């Protein structure tokens, strides 16, 4: 599995160094350093999102360009860390205006449709297109919850939360008060949340068939980048989420599917 | 008001009748590094003002410091013939000052001040030193049965940090202490990472220390009762002044040992070998 190979510490360090070298040393057709200008424009307008084109990444690193579409989570995390390091080197004071630099992947060669997504595409970086039909408001979501212990008043460390399950607390050093654990509202970290709904294009839908739809999740800078009735090109991680209600309804164990959005382009 | 007490002490120190300025001459000698131990006698205070004598006898802890500070203030106006010494501490201070251009009073102190029991005060047996004389001035007598070797005792510590140049200070007013681990200098606080400062033994202050046990005279002890002992702490010029098997009479301060029930020790001020 590519996930196991990229999970290796030495492989992780090698990928980190390669991405740092790619960011620092990537000349253009005229020799200009593209990422210097990109980071300058990003920090000049107080953004926290850095776009990366897949074509030049493949041109300068084919191994990573092959690893990315198969393990898009850890690879993107390493890319984010390397980008943050490069930005901090270039702009030492940017730790005030931002706390995490995100990497957005553009021009992914593979393009699919909402009607041809199967279990083969699970946990892979896919690229689809469609028309937005629903857009909920921006709600706050728990990012890193800081659980406390009533037995000792000491507060446990951060615990990351995913969009697929409910995070549970760990173990206190010596007084094992697993039960009496709560959450404080002044040390926890939150993040923006928005769940859009995309459907097939009016022109591209088969006459005999009916339009299909899939749910997408937008977080952090991605929120409020779409409005209902807009044609978009969505790149994200196809993700599988259990839904017992559908199981009971259909009478057969079935799971819901959602897309964790990573890059959105409006055409 | 302790300030008024200090002014009164200074007034007594500068002007003493004998009008031979014994205190003035001795302070000049100290400023010339010719004398270390200055023994203030309380009968002279009784000649001037007995109220100060009673007040100092009730609590011989604050007024010792008051006398020390008064002597320290009077010292600068008597340094006539500069200095002829080669103190390592002074060399360290001089080089640090030279780098500075490029301080606790105890740190800049080498005189030890002691009091003498007034003629009115009478000697007391070890059994007669009860708990009502804690913090007062007492005069016990007995036979020394054990003396320890003189060892250095840390008084004030002088740490140095590699990150900064400002030397750290840490007075030691307890029998035990914990050494400083992280450097608290503002230079290190600005760096958001306290330096791993280390104590510089060259720039530290050490004083001579001695411990001895004083017993009771057999004749004074009741026939049925067994003799009792007492621990005496000796620091400064008073060290190497007594040997085991010598009849002595010690004037000092009765204090408890802290480390609701506590042991007691005697802070020696003046040791005399009676017979």
């Amino acid at each position: 599995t590519v996930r196991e190979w990229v999970s290796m510490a030495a492989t992780r360090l090698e990928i980190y160094h390669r991405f740092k070298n790619f960011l620092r040393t990537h000349v253009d057709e005229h020799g200009h350093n593209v990422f210097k200008e990109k980071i300058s424009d990003m920090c000049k307008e107080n953004k926290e999102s850095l776009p990366v084109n897949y074509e030049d990444l493949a041109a300068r690193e084919h191994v990573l360009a092959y690893f990315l579409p198969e393990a898009p989570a850890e690879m993107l995390k390493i890319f984010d860390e390397a980008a943050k390091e490069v930005v901090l080197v270039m702009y030492p004071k940017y730790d005030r205006i931002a706390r995490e630099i995100h990497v957005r992947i553009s021009h992914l060669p593979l393009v699919e449709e909402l009607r041809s997504l199967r279990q083969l595409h699970l946990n892979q970086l896919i690229r689809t297109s469609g028309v937005v039909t629903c857009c909920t408001g921006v709600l706050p979501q728990l990012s890193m919850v800081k659980y406390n212990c009533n037995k000792c008043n000491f507060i446990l460390g951060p615990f990351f939360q995913s969009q697929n399950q409910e995070v549970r607390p760990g173990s206190c050093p010596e007084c094992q008060s697993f039960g009496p654990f709560e959450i404080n509202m002044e040390e926890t970290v939150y993040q923006n949340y928005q769940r859009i709904t995309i459907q097939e294009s009016p022109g591209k839908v088969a006459a005999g068939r009916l339009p299909r739809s899939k749910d997408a999740i937008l977080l952090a800078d991605l929120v409020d980048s779409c409005k209902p009735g807009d044609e978009i090109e969505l790149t994200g991680i196809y993700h599988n989420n259990y839904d017992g209600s559908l199981n009971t309804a259909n009478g057969f164990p079935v799971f819901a599917t959602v897309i964790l959005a990573n890059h959105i382009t409006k055409k | 008001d302790y300030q008024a007490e200090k002014e009164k002490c200074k007034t007594f120190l500068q002007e003493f009748y004998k009008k031979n300025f014994k205190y003035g001459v001795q302070l000049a000698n100290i400023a010339h590094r010719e004398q270390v131990a200055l023994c203030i006698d309380l009968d002279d205070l009784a000649e001037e003002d007995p109220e100060l004598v009673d007040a100092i006898c009730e609590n011989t802890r604050r007024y010792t410091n008051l006398f020390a500070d008064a002597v320290q203030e009077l010292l600068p106006q008597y340094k006539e013939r500069e200095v002829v010494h080669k103190d390592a501490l002074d060399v360290y201070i001089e080089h640090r000052l030279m780098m500075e251009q490029r301080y606790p009073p105890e740190l800049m102190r080498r005189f030890e001040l002691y009091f003498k029991a007034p003629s009115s005060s009478k000697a007391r047996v070890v059994r007669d030193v009860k708990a009502d004389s804690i913090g007062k001035l007492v005069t016990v007598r007995g036979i020394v049965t054990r003396v320890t070797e003189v060892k250095p005792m840390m008084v004030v510590a002088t740490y140095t940090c590699d990150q900064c140049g400002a030397e750290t200070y840490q007075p030691i007013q307890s029998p035990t202490f914990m050494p400083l681990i992280m450097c608290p200098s503002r230079e290190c606080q600005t760096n958001r990472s306290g330096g791993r400062l280390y104590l510089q033994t060259r720039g530290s202050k050490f004083i001579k220390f001695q411990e001895l046990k004083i017993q009771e005279h057999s004749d004074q002890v009741p026939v049925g009762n067994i003799p009792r002992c007492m621990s005496v702490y000796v620091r400064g010029e008073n060290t190497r002044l007594a040997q085991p098997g010598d009849h002595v009479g010690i004037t000092g301060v009765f204090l408890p040992m802290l480390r609701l029930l506590s042991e007691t020790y005697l802070e020696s001020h003046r040791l005399v070998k009676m017979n």
Binding site: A9, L13 | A88, Y92, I93, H95, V150, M153, R202, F206
Partner: protein, 258 residues
């Protein structure tokens, strides 16, 4: 250095001239003998240094920690100038021995801390070899990166973050590879002459190192030249509180069997 009047260049030149200008250049003759002897050390009496430059002698006595290495450098340089072809196992070690004891085992006031003194006594008991770590071997446990950290004031620093993988709490001390030296503990009593009337003899702890190990035996009346050292002592092994009173010991520099 800081708070110290030593000057490496000036003291080195003074030592070289003193060896050359020792008309009583006898030390040059001793170096000539060493050229064939093959033992890189030089025994020097303090009084000759006083005669040449009482100022340099005062600097040596007050701060023997750094003056002695400077004298070692100067002696090695002059020996190499006289005999470049001579081959030695290591550098010359000058030992500024003193003819007579400055003070007895008593009167060792705290002012004598970190200063050169000479005493006399009788060896009572000698300890075995006590290895001491000098250069610490910290090896990473995340990426297996090796380091060769050395001693610095005796407080060896341990970097949690590795230099290759940059992972905290990765360096581990493999003492089986770290460099080690030798030590020895010797108990020395007080001679009856120094003993006052009706006083039992005292004892002093002496620490010998390297060649000085196994140079004295029990029952031998010898004179010892060394540095007066004071170290803090903790109240308990687990507790880090330190007692105000510091115990004292002597780091020997020269042994005179006398």
């Amino acid at each position: 250095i800081w708070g110290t009047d030593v000057n490496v260049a000036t003291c080195k030149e003074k030592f070289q001239r003193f060896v050359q200008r020792f008309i009583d250049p006898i030390y040059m003759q001793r170096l000539e003998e060493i050229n064939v002897v093959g033992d890189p050390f030089l025994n020097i009496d303090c009084d000759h240094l006083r005669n040449f430059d009482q100022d340099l002698y005062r600097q040596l006595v007050c701060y023997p920690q750094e003056v002695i290495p400077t004298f070692d450098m100067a002696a090695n340089e002059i020996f190499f100038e006289r005999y470049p072809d001579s081959i030695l196992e290591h550098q010359i070690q000058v030992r500024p021995y003193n003819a007579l004891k400055t003070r007895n085992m008593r009167s060792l006031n705290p002012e004598d801390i970190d200063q050169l003194i000479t005493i006399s006594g009788m060896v009572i008991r000698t300890s075995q070899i006590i290895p001491e770590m000098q250069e610490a071997f910290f090896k990473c446990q995340v990426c297996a990166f090796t380091t060769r950290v050395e001693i610095d004031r005796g407080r060896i620093a341990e970097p949690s973050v590795c230099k290759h993988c940059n992972t905290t709490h990765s360096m581990a001390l493999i003492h089986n590879r770290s460099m080690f030296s030798d030590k020895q503990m010797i108990k020395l009593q007080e001679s009856p002459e120094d003993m006052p009337a009706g006083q039992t003899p005292h004892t002093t702890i002496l620490y010998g190192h390297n060649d000085l190990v196994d140079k004295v035996q029990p029952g031998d009346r010898v004179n010892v030249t060394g540095i007066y050292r004071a170290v803090p002592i903790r109240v308990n092994p687990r507790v880090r509180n330190v007692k105000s009173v510091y115990k004292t010991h002597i780091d020997v520099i020269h042994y005179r069997k006398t």
